[PDB]
Design a protein around this nucleic acid. Structure first.
Ligand SMILES: [K+]
Ligand SMILES: [K+]
Ligand SMILES: [K+]
Ligand SMILES: [K+]
Ligand SMILES: [Mg+2]
Ligand SMILES: [Mg+2]
Ligand SMILES: [Mg+2]
Ligand SMILES: [Mg+2]
Ligand SMILES: [Mg+2]
Ligand SMILES: [Mg+2]
Ligand SMILES: [Mg+2]
Ligand SMILES: [Mg+2]
Length: 176
RNA sequence: AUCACUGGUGUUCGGGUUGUCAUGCCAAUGGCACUGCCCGGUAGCUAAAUGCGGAAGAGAUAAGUGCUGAAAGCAUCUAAG
């Protein structure tokens, strides 16, 4: 509703294309396409997209609000792009990128190699930092979640793979 | 599952031996006595013998964990995906 009302602006250089429900956004950072829910009517208008419910759908305003938030992320994706940062905490925990495969040393008796998906790249500044980059906000979120899952932050020392902007509450071992 | 090995059985293979009857007798043999009683043992069957098995992988999930995400300007694993 309120989210669906605010239209999204197409900055210069971004080219939208609507084939019924299938949309395609093309920018300097790549090309993203989505099939919108059959209850959403989207209009290109004058360098600004608008979103509204179609007639005969009881949830059109809920479906238009999500279609708006996604297309707004698609436009940001093909220009500024998205970035996620992860830190490793713990003596001996290290990371390193070789091609599109991240090598994790997380205290296991075996190595952890994580293959990145199609349009995601990863740089390791220090050995305890990973920086992901990509145009798809959902994909970069999934990749970061998969890397965090190898060694979730534990509550007694905060050790593991954490999001850089993550608050990790710790607690003290029970006395006696 | 199998019998190469280790073994059991092995009244159809060989031997020892008690009592008695017979083959004229000696010598040699056979019958009967739980296979007379025993000692070994071939093939076969067999276990205690010795080979092998339970999986890996894949698909769709349970509880559970998430990503993106509005309805509800926030939040939200869910309503779409
Ligand atoms: K045998
Ligand atoms: K035998
Ligand atoms: K006799
Ligand atoms: K969320
Ligand atoms: Mg034999
Ligand atoms: Mg024997
Ligand atoms: Mg015998
Ligand atoms: Mg005589
Ligand atoms: Mg007689
Ligand atoms: Mg008689
Ligand atoms: Mg399995
Ligand atoms: Mg949201």
């Amino acid at each position: 509703s309120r989210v669906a009302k605010a239209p999204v602006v197409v900055p210069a250089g971004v080219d939208v294309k609507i084939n019924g429900q299938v949309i395609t956004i093309k920018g300097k950072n790549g090309e993203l396409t989505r099939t919108l829910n059959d209850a959403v009517e989207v209009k290109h208008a004058d360098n600004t997209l608008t979103f509204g419910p179609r007639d005969g759908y009881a949830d059109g305003w809920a479906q238009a609000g999500t279609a708006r938030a996604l297309l707004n992320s698609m436009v940001i994706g093909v220009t500024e792009g998205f970035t996620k940062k992860l830190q490793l905490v713990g003596v001996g925990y290290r990371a390193a990128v070789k091609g599109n495969v991240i090598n994790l040393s997380l205290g296991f008796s075996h190595p952890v190699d994580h293959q990145l998906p199609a349009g995601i790249t990863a740089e390791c500044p220090t050995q305890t930092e990973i920086v992901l980059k990509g145009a798809d906000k959902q994909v970069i979120g999934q990749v970061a979640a998969d890397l965090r899952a190898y060694r979730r932050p534990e509550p007694y020392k905060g050790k593991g793979v954490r999001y850089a902007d993550e608050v990790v509450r710790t607690k003290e071992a029970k006395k006696k």
